[PDB]
Amino acid sequence: DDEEETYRLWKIRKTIMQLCHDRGYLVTQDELDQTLEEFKAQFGDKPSEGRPRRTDLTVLVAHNDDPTDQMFVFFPEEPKVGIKTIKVYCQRMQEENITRALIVVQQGMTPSAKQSLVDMAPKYILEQFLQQELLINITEHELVPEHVVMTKEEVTELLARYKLRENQLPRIQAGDPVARYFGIKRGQVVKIIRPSETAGRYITYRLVQ
């Protein structure tokens, strides 16, 4: 089909825009809430054997606070990404001066690709994202409370206030869907805001490990 593919591409694009907005990257208001119709009109309404193909709607976004912190979002064509595709993506990012990529695969990439991706991490950080995980925005689910990423200074302020070491905080693993949504790395602390039926509102903290 082509109509369902158009719907899928629009949906994943919308979720990527929301994710970039959540991380603090500068996403304009108009493209954040562009409905299906303008997407169809501007990209092509015919992904199958048509101009709205992949690698055409890849997006670079710059950080709102810092103009020189940017992220590519790529949509590879081959269902199973191999070493060649991530290698050419590395090459493309090489002439650019940016170090952050967001891959949206259609099926799980090859184990060699994952191993190279995790070996590449210290200089060039990039993540994979199955398109199935992107058809919905999980932070809008009622079960997922408010997640906020905490700066290092306020983490130190927390630790000083409660006089506890970082290993005594509750933990969250980097493989968590919300953790991957916010792209947080180890040693980084997340504030969590919940509505409580006994207090009214409860704030807890989680250390990424």
Binding site: E157, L158, R161, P195, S196, E197, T198, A199, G200, R201, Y202, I203
Partner: protein, 97 residues
């Protein structure tokens, strides 16, 4: 505070669990001092306002003046403070109690 409750309590279930049974203590106060809820009383409403405000400062759960500490203290007794304000209203103290 009404809007805050409505976003904490969807489906409109007002049965909550709280420390002090305010209505029963109001009834006790009415019966101890022989209030006679038929004659006009001598209770300046600003006394009600200031009394609620100064009571809210004494019920401390998180102790400290740090902004983090103040936020934690405010969040800990948010629900009870909402209930206290919704009960000890100047109008409710002026026409019902």
């Amino acid at each position: 505070d009404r809007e805050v409750l409505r976003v904490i309590f969807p489906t409109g279930d007002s049965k909550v669990v709280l420390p002090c049974n305010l209505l029963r203590m109001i009834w006790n106060a009415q019966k101890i001092f022989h209030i006679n809820p038929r004659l006009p009383s001598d209770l300046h409403p600003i006394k009600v306002v200031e009394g609620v405000k100064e009571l809210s400062k004494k019920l401390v759960i998180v102790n400290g003046d740090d902004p983090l500490s103040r936020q934690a203290q405010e969040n800990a007794t948010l629900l009870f403070n909402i209930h206290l304000r919704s009960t000890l209203c100047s109008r409710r103290m002026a026409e019902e109690f």
